[PDB]
Design a protein around this ligand. Structure first.
Ligand SMILES: CCOC(=O)c1c(NC(=O)C2=C(C(=O)O)CCC2)sc2c1CCCC2
Length: 134
């Protein structure tokens, strides 16, 4: 096993704060924000060797990334940004940096009690999204 084990599994979104504001700062347009903000995604995390997969599933849209820690990859985000992403495991927190158009956003995923807490930061604005096991 590995430490990245306490992330593996199926997680459901139980709360969100400031997500609309985070998406505004990212540059997401009105209609996409409205539809994206309604979603109640499940997050499915799995590991196979050095490859980590994170899926986000909702009735409206399903997305998936697979990656190796520290190794940059291409990502098309759920709002259709084409970004270059790097994910590292720093002090037990998955830290995901997305770069596009000279901009940057960082998404941190951490275990806290029985939750998986997702903190999304774009130029002063933080959104906190809390998941629990499905
Ligand atoms: C930033 C734009 O995000 C979206 O457009 C977006 C989501 N985004 C998320 O769920 C995000 C996170 C999460 O809880 O996994 C982390 C940051 C985005 S979930 C979803 C959409 C758009 C389509 C429906 C489902």
């Amino acid at each position: 096993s590995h430490m990245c084990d306490a992330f593996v599994g199926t997680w459901k979104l139980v709360s969100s704060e400031n997500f609309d504001d985070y998406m505004k700062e990212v540059g997401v347009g009105f209609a996409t924000r409205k539809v994206a903000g309604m979603a109640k995604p499940n997050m499915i995390i799995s590991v196979n060797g050095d490859v980590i997969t994170i899926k986000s599933e909702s009735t409206f849209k399903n997305t998936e990334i697979s990656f190796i820690l520290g190794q940059e990859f291409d990502e098309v985000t759920a709002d259709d940004r084409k970004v270059k992403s790097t994910i590292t495991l720093d002090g037990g927190v998955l830290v995901h940096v997305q770069k596009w158009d000279g901009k940057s956003t960082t998404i941190k995923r951490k275990r806290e009690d029985d939750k998986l807490v997702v903190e999304c930061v774009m130029k002063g604005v933080t959104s906190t999204r809390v998941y629990e096991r499905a």
